[PDB]
């Protein structure tokens, strides 16, 4: 098991340490999408 | 776009019931909550209750739990608020808003509910002008007093709207069950009483418009 970075943003390029996790908090509505990413390990994205 | 359309004003004696309509447009009616807000003139504001049109459940407050009843209709995309046991302190301005992220994103146009046992009475203007025994000073303010008109309010024309700058329109206050208002405009004693000033109220409900000369 190795760390998969789900959250990757252009604003986090200055602080790479924020890439290792994504936040979760209290929601006021029903069924918000927290995160989504591709399942292909050989594609440019989180799997790198 | 999203638009919330309410009904007009209502006038009913204490002890009866009233229903107020709120109709959403341009958005899914059963998807989001529909709130209600009362504003007591003029400093009071508080939240009433919400309803989810899909299920039909209602979440009320502690004080309004027994007084108000909320219903909704999915076919016409319209929400209803029914008030029971109307008293004199229950007359205020009601709002219709929706909840999205937990705040109120869009409001309504507003409605006025007046609960009183008084009926429509024609107003009677009482002239007030300087003066007997007092010529001081060379510049005095003029106007006329209005009493006993229901409901509020009426507009006071001055010489068919000749000069609106120095005249001040004062709000009405309820006294002995009827509304009373006053008006004040300043005129120099050099041009008075050369031109006769005139104040005339216009009341649409009672169809009574009186003219008075000084």
């Amino acid at each position: 098991e190795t760390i998969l970075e789900v959250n990757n943003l252009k604003t986090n390029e200055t602080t790479p340490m924020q890439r290792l996790c994504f936040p979760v908090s209290v929601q006021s509505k029903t069924g918000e999408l927290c995160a989504a990413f591709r399942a292909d390990p050989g594609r440019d994205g989180p799997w790198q | 776009q999203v638009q919330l359309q309410q009904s007009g004003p209502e006038l009913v004696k204490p002890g009866a019931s009233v229903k107020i309509s709120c109709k959403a447009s341009g958005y899914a009616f059963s998807t989001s909550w529909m709130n209600w807000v009362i504003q007591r003139p003029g400093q009071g504001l508080e939240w009433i209750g919400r309803i989810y049109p899909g299920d039909g459940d209602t979440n009320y407050n502690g004080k309004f739990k027994g007084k108000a009843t909320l219903t909704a209709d999915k076919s016409s995309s319209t929400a209803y608020m029914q008030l029971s046991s109307l008293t004199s302190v229950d007359s205020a301005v009601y709002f219709c808003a929706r909840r999205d992220y937990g705040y109120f994103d869009y409001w309504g146009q507003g409605t006025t509910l007046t609960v009183s046992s008084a009926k429509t009475t024609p107003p009677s203007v009482y002239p007030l002008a300087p003066g007997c025994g007092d010529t001081t000073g060379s510049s005095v303010t003029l106007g006329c007093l209005v009493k006993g008109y229901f409901p509020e309010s009426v507009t006071v024309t001055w010489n068919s709207g000749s000069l609106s700058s120095s005249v001040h329109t004062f709000p009405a206050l309820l006294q002995s069950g009827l509304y009373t208002m006053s008006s004040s405009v300043t005129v120099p004693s050099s041009t008075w009483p050369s031109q006769t000033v005139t104040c005339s109220v216009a009341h649409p409900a009672s169809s009574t418009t009186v003219d008075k000369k000084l």
Binding site: V26, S28 | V37, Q43, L45, E46, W47, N59, N61, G62, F95, Y101, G102, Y103, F104, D105, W107, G108, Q109, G110, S124, Y126, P127, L128, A129, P130, G131, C132, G133, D134, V140, T141, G143, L145, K147, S165, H168, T169, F170, P171, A172, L173, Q175, S176, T180, M181, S182, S184, T186
Partner: protein, 213 residues
């Protein structure tokens, strides 16, 4: 039941300056607050959502900020369309407690009032009651004290004061006062007068009246 206090009720700043309005609650709301703007006769309008983020269509002059239980609203600069009553909401817990509200007005110098007493009409006594009036105009600030004294007395209740807010042109206020009662008390005495006390001047202006003039 979460009490959220908004103080004070009235504060005045001129145009081109900065204004700060504080809305404080009893417990931690987790930075959930909504600032509102309501013009007289209109519906409230949302400005700040979550004490930080803005809306779509709102200018960038409105900037909210805060931490803990103390939250502020900074508006720079101030214009003529930004003058209204501001509110704050707590949507963290039910029921949602609305703020007390802050009414904004423009600040200027001090102006001396004008007191003019008026005689009742000659045909006014046909209705069955009499009302004496003295009207005030062109004064500032809000807080004053109306005084009715006949032979060293003070009469309450039955007096009323109808205030009129400021407008765009002269930024000036006005007030009126009167009372209604039966016939027989009116001629009990003769001279009639009223005045209004003010803070910056211990001696006010006096305008009297007499019936037999």
């Amino acid at each position: 039941d979460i009490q959220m206090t908004q103080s004070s009720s009235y504060l005045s700043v001129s145009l081109g300056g900065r204004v700060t309005i504080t809305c404080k609650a009893s417990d931690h709301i987790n930075n959930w607050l909504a600032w509102y703007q309501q013009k007289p006769g209109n519906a409230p309008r949302l400005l700040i959502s979550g004490a930080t983020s803005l809306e779509t269509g709102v200018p960038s002059r409105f900037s909210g900020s805060g931490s803990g239980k103390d939250y502020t609203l900074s508006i720079t600069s101030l214009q003529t369309e930004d003058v209204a009553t501001y509110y704050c909401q707590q949507y963290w817990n039910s029921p949602y407690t609305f703020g007390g509200g802050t009414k904004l007005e423009i600040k200027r110098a001090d102006a001396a009032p004008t007191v003019s007493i008026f005689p009742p009409s000659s045909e006014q006594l046909t209705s069955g009651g009499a009302s004496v009036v003295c009207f005030l105009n062109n004064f500032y600030p809000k807080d004053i004290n109306v005084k009715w004294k006949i032979d060293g007395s003070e009469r309450q209740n039955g007096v009323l004061n109808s205030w009129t807010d400021q407008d765009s042109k002269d930024s000036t206020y006005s007030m009126s006062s009167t009372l209604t009662l039966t016939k027989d008390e009116y001629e009990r005495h003769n001279s009639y007068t009223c005045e209004a006390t003010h803070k910056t001047s211990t001696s006010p202006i006096v305008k009297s009246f007499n019936r037999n003039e």
